């Protein structure tokens, strides 16, 4: 019998005792204590995991299982190598790949890499329009090159650079929470807010399209003390819209968040923005502390890789301080939320627009719309476009229109060959099908969807099959590995495509299995690039 195990070192106990101070030692804050240890010390030493488990009355298995799921926590045991102080991350994703990310990754992985710096790949940092994107110790470099990264590293320009944004007083000078103040006081009934929200037809902008008013009403119907969470994960490779609104007009989002909390009576709300957004984190921390006291207490939570944590059940489980594994859906997350209490989760995009509907009317929202579709959408456009960035355009906008009316053209020396609507989650489409309106319910008949309005333009200078391989590798790395079809199917599909010619029939069968028997939406869409490139690019096999 060998039940001894590993003895918590006394030195590691005092360090976590002083480190935690008076913070609550409840499992719900496990991820946050992991962040605290990872930040105070560039790694999470095994003795530190043991000390944290002792302080939080957990098992070593529990803390290790939680802390090795996120790709930004560096567990280091007695035999592992010490992580260097500076960690520069090179995005390896479709757009940064178009702009020489892999070549750049190799370049600075052999030139400025050393024992004092670590160069690793990253899925995506929402900086696609400024590709290639590289992070240097919380400082993300736009259109990174060898010289720029070298200057950043040698100058110690590691910390994030906070931009100029409308502060709390500036927001007061205009809107200034007047709509919220008219809600916290009985001047406009909550029924009117829901009525206008439903009439406008605003739909969830995180990549589902579910009406916001319906979510709010359904959660309001559920009894008991309700809760609310905000999805700032925005992990889709082609999506950067949310970061733009966080770092420009945070208080519009905060007003929407407070309106949603009041409409639901949620005593408190949680924000789950990425750790790839130091700018947004600092902005919210500054402005979260300037709102008036009372109302609903608002918590700002931080992520760690784990693209899957953007899934609502996964986000719930991550907020619970455990692995961001999604949940089965006999119980919906609005019925049984994070603490088993009904909660609504909304993207920071949809919270950004509620104020305008309440103050400017539903007719304003329904006045826009290019094709038969209605509404207003923020498009994240990157790649082979003359002007890449977030485009606030009407709904039902065909990609040809979105390119030659908002992007200023395609490029010099490039031709429009293929595009992917909705990002990696959606499938690649040929440029010959440019007459397809882009909206929530107009892209399914082609096996695609536009979740976050992430649009990446493929030219004739880039191979569609390489793009599909990149997307498959992204899904393979990002799957939480809970169910079989996703965990194993992503790996098998990636393996099948490292060959010169892959088996179309086998890939189709595996894609059908993945799409039919996967637990969450990550695996139900992981095979979309493969099937789409097979179907709409017959002349590539």
């Amino acid at each position: 019998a060998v039940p001894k195990g590993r003895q918590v070192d006394p030195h590691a106990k005092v360090e976590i005792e002083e480190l935690l101070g008076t913070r609550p030692r409840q499992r719900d804050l496990l991820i946050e204590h992991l962040h605290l240890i990872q930040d105070t010390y560039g790694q999470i030493s095994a003795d530190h995991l043991a000390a944290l488990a002792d302080e939080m009355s957990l098992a070593f298995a529990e803390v290790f299982e939680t802390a090795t799921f996120y790709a930004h926590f560096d567990v280091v045991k007695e035999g592992e190598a010490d992580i260097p102080r500076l960690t520069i991350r090179v995005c390896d994703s479709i757009t940064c790949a178009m702009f020489g990310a892999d070549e750049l990754l190799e370049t600075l992985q052999r030139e400025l890499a050393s024992d004092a710096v670590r160069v690793v790949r990253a899925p995506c940092v929402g900086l696609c329009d400024h590709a290639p994107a590289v992070e240097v110790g919380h400082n993300f470099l736009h259109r990174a090159d060898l010289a720029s990264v070298r200057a950043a590293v040698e100058a110690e320009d590691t910390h994030a650079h906070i931009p100029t944004y409308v502060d709390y007083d500036a927001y007061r000078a205009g809107g200034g929470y007047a709509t919220l103040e008219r809600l916290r006081s009985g001047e406009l009934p909550v029924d009117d807010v829901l009525k206008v929200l439903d009439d406008g037809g605003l739909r969830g902008l995180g990549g589902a399209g579910f009406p916001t008013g319906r979510k709010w009403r359904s959660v309001r119907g559920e009894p008991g003390p309700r809760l609310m969470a905000v999805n700032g994960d925005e992990g889709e490779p082609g999506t950067f819209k949310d970061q733009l609104y966080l770092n420009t007009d945070p208080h519009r989002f905060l007003e929407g968040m407070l309106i949603g909390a009041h409409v639901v009576e949620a005593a408190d709300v949680y924000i789950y923005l990425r750790d790839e957004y130091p700018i947004s984190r600092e902005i919210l921390a500054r402005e979260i502390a300037k709102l008036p006291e009372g109302g609903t207490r608002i918590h700002l939570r931080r992520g760690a890789g784990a693209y899957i944590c953007g899934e609502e059940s996964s986000l719930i489980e991550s907020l619970e301080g455990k692995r961001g594994l999604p949940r089965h859906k006999p119980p919906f997350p609005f019925q049984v939320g994070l603490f088993n209490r009904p909660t609504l989760i909304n993207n920071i995009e949809t919270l950004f627009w509620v104020r305008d509907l309440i103050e400017r009317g539903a007719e304003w929202w329904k006045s826009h719309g290019r094709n038969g579709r209605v509404g207003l959408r923020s498009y994240s456009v990157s790649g082979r476009v003359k002007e890449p960035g977030v485009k606030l355009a009407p709904a039902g906008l065909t990609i040809q229109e979105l390119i030659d009316e908002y992007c200023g053209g395609i490029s010099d020396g490039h031709s429009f060959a293929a595009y992917l609507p909705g990002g990696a989650s959606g499938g690649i489409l040929p440029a010959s099908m440019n007459d397809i309106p882009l909206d929530f319910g107009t892209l399914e008949k082609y096996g695609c969807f536009i979740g976050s309005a992430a649009v990446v333009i493929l030219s004739d200078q880039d191979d569609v099959r390489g793009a599909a391989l990149n997307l498959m590798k992204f899904f393979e790395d990002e799957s939480c590995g809970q169910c079989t079809p996703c965990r194993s199917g992503t790996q098998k599909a990636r393996m099948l495509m490292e060959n010169g010619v892959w088996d179309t029939d086998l890939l189709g069968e595996l894609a059908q299995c993945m799409r039919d028997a996967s637990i969450c939406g990550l695996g139900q869409a992981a095979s979309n690039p493969v099937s789409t490139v097979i179907k709409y690019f017959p002349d590539l096999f």
């Binding site: 039940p3 590993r6 298995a61 990002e478 939480c480």
Partner: protein
């Protein structure tokens, strides 16, 4: 009930039944890898082998985890579902090592794959983790792992040992133990629950594999019996390979939920020990019976000599006969064993009562829990637990004062952990030293050793002065509630905090929580009992349970943890020198006459001497001649000139042990006994359940059954006993034991176990006793205060 449609035909589903369970009931079972249809395993739908098609849904559903709702239409034979299941199996097979030299090539996974006709895979295999063999008893080879997660449920939900987890993401997600260590140095307790929960050979016992980690041994025979280590009555299924026990699996007993500890999984090798007595031994006349002599177990012929089963047996039964007929009937005594069957214990005490004609019957295992049983009998007229340890699943507050079940009754501790982790149960560990259960404890009242009566009296004073007691229960079911009320005033938390180790506010909180709880069980062991003057420790515990009313209803009672195979059934058999079988007083004239007429011989009126009394009387020479069965008094109590010297002064010692133990060093005749593995009979556990044991192997050499030796000694003592086996002995003793009234050998063979206070043949017994009064003459219990007189 839900009247839904499955595979085109309407069916009915019991409440809480999943679609998979309904399908299995109707016979149309479907593949399952992550789902383990055994008690205690929560269906997790992460294998997607159980996929079915239910109308109205955009995707397939895991009948593993999904329950049928009214109007639901399910189809599992459709092309969609069959293809999805086959693709899942194909992916996993592509990940599998092999099916010729693999780990458990007949595993559950391979059976399910054969069901789906998935022999090979079209998808490339992937390199996996290396085999790990650090732990001696069981080898993990994750290269076969399916990530079905069953092992984490087994370690963290069923046993709640918390030594397993899936820490990585994606395909890299692997099974770890604690910080991904090789297990051989982790906190693993080797209970084997994960090994019994793996659907592949990724987790196997190390005795089924070889150097190459391929399955080698397939046990030809498997026999189900009990575990002779704990008093928890943990049922086992022993695996026999070439007339040897090579592995043990837990079965669905009523005390264990298919779960064992390390001692049930392994440790069976004691039966096949090389140094196991096989032939009777007689002490040769040349060798003197030295006080400090040590017989070599490897060389038992330095002090003893070979002899047939009629020479040694005659010597044993003749020395005692001569002693009784010359020195007197009061010069003999016998020590039974709480390790043998109830039929052996009854037969042994009957021999010591008839052939020796006295009451000098006492098994050394009763010294521990002696005080607790004394107090429980004084207050309640019954020494048995009031509730099963499975009652913790219904109790709101659990008290584990003075016990360490996680080490000594691991399955009971697992049930306590399940109560905590699945119900709103608050367990309080009232132990001076920190305990593994402390991490799951609402409070841990670490108090100075010996300062237990003080703090329990403080809790009683809190309950009394605060009016927490329910006057309704006292007035109608108890006596003497006013006597303590006079003296409880003196003991108060403010004063008792100093002498104790708990602050007054903590004592107040614990007492209030215990009193106001709807249900509240108390568990205790040797910590309070073996402590000098352990009757007071028990007395105040009974007072707490009694004034508060926490007794006689589900989730409530007093359950001292008996740490021996069948000490409870040994006492029920009459191995006590102060009472007959079934706790019938030996001094009562009516009881004496009942046995005198039934046993057909005059019986000794005066109560027999206790084990310590016998040991100290050996020194005075009042008692000369013994018969020790399944006990080692030579190394039980302090043995310098009180226990070892006592045995050497015996005129004639007979011992019936499995090994040439220390107590057998001074034995004139050694009787090779059969172990629990190679014996039949019945055993009673701490839970008060009577279970039947079965032989798995044969005794080494010509070693005989214990009851056979006892009967032979009786026959040579003129008793003329004729029993054909344990069944006849059980019937005879059931004819005289009110406890075993409506239970028979035929009924005990079926159903595995029967809690003996039963009313009808088909009734399940009375797990909770004292529900409608107490067996006391007045029909109500007594509240006895505890006296502190240092």
């Amino acid at each position: 009930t839900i009247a839904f449609e499955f595979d085109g035909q309407q069916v009915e589903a019991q409440p809480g039944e999943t679609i998979w369970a309904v399908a299995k009931r109707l016979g149309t079972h479907i593949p399952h890898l992550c789902h383990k249809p055994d008690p205690g395993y929560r269906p997790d739908g992460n294998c997607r082998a159980c996929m079915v098609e239910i109308e109205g849904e955009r995707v397939l559903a895991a009948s593993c985890k999904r329950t049928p709702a009214i109007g639901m239409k399910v189809k599992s034979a459709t092309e969609r579902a069959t293809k999805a299941r086959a693709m899942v199996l194909e992916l996993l097979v592509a990940d599998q090592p092999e099916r010729a030299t693999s780990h458990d090539p007949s595993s559950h996974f391979w059976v399910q794959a054969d069901v789906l006709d998935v022999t090979e895979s079209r998808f490339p295999a992937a390199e996996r983790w290396t085999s790990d063999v650090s732990h001696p008893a069981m080898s993990v080879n994750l290269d076969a792992c399916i990530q079905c997660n069953l092992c984490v449920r087994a370690c963290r939900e069923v046993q709640v040992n918390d030594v397993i987890g899936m820490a990585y993401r994606a395909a890299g997600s692997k099974v770890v133990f604690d910080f991904d260590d090789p297990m051989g140095g982790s906190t693993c307790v080797a209970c084997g629950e994960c090994v019994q929960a793996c659907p592949t050979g990724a987790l196997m016992p190390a005795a089924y594999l070889d150097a190459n980690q391929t399955r080698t041994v397939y046990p030809d025979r498997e026999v189900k019996s009990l575990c002779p280590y704990c008093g928890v009555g943990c049922q086992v299924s022993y695996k026999v390979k070439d007339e040897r026990i090579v592995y043990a699996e837990g079965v669905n007993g009523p005390a264990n939920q298919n779960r064992l500890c390390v001692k049930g999984r392994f440790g069976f090798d004691y039966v096949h020990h090389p140094h196991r007595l096989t032939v009777p031994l007689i002490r040769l006349e040349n060798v003197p019976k030295d006080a400090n002599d040590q017989v070599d177990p490897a060389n038992p012929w330095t002090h003893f000599r070979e002899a047939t089963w009629e020479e040694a047996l005659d010597r044993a039964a003749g020395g005692l006969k001569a002693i009784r007929d010359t020195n007197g009937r009061k010069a003999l005594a016998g020590f039974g064993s709480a390790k043998g069957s109830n039929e052996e214990a009854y037969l042994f005490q009957k021999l010591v009562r008839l052939g020796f004609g006295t009451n000098n019957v006492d098994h050394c295992t009763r010294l521990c829990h002696a005080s607790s049983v004394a107090a429980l009998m004084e207050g309640l007229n019954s020494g048995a637990v009031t509730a099963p340890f499975s009652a913790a699943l219904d109790a709101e507050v659990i008290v584990v004062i003075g016990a360490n079940p996680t080490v000594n009754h691991p399955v009971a501790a697992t049930f306590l952990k399940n109560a905590v982790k699945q119900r709103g149960a608050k367990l309080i560990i009232m132990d001076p030293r920190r305990q593994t259960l402390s991490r799951h404890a609402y409070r841990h009242l670490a108090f100075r050793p010996g300062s237990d009566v003080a703090m329990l009296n403080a809790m009683l004073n809190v309950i009394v002065t605060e009016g927490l007691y329910d006057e309704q229960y006292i007035a109608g079911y108890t006596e003497n509630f006013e006597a303590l009320r006079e003296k409880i005033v003196d003991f108060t938390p403010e004063k008792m905090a100093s002498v104790c180790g708990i602050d007054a506010e903590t004592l107040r909180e614990v007492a209030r929580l215990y009193a106001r709880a709807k249900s509240s069980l108390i568990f205790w062991g040797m910590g309070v009992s073996q402590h000098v003057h352990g009757t007071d420790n028990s007395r105040c515990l009974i007072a707490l349970a009694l004034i508060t009313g926490q007794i006689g209803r589900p989730g409530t009672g007093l359950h001292p943890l008996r740490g021996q195979n069948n000490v409870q059934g040994a006492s029920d058999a009459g191995l006590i020198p102060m009472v007959y079988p079934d706790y019938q007083s030996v001094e009562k004239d009516a009881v004496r006459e009942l046995f005198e007429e039934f046993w057909g011989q005059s019986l000794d009126p005066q109560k027999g001497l206790t084990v310590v009394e016998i040991m100290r009387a050996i020194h005075a020479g009042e008692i000369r001649g013994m018969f020790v069965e399944g006990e080692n008094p030579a190394m039980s109590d302090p043995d310098l000139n009180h226990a070892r010297h006592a045995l050497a002064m015996l005129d004639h010692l007979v011992v019936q042990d499995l090994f040439l133990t220390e107590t057998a060093f001074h034995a004139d005749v050694v009787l090779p006994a059969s172990a629990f593995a190679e014996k039949a009979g019945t055993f009673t556990n701490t839970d008060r359940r009577v279970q039947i044991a079965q032989p798995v192997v044969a005794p080494p050499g010509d070693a005989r059954q214990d009851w056979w030796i006892i009967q032979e000694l009786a026959r040579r003592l003129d008793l003329d006993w004729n029993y054909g086996g344990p069944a006849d002995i059980f019937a005879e003793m059931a004819q005289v034991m009110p406890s075993l009234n409506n239970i028979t050998w035929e009924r005990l063979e079926r159903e595995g176990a029967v809690t003996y206070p039963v009313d009808a043949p088909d009734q399940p017994g009375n797990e909770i006793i004292f529900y409608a009064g107490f067996p006391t003459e007045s029909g109500r219990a007594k509240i006895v205060p505890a006296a502190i007189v240092p």
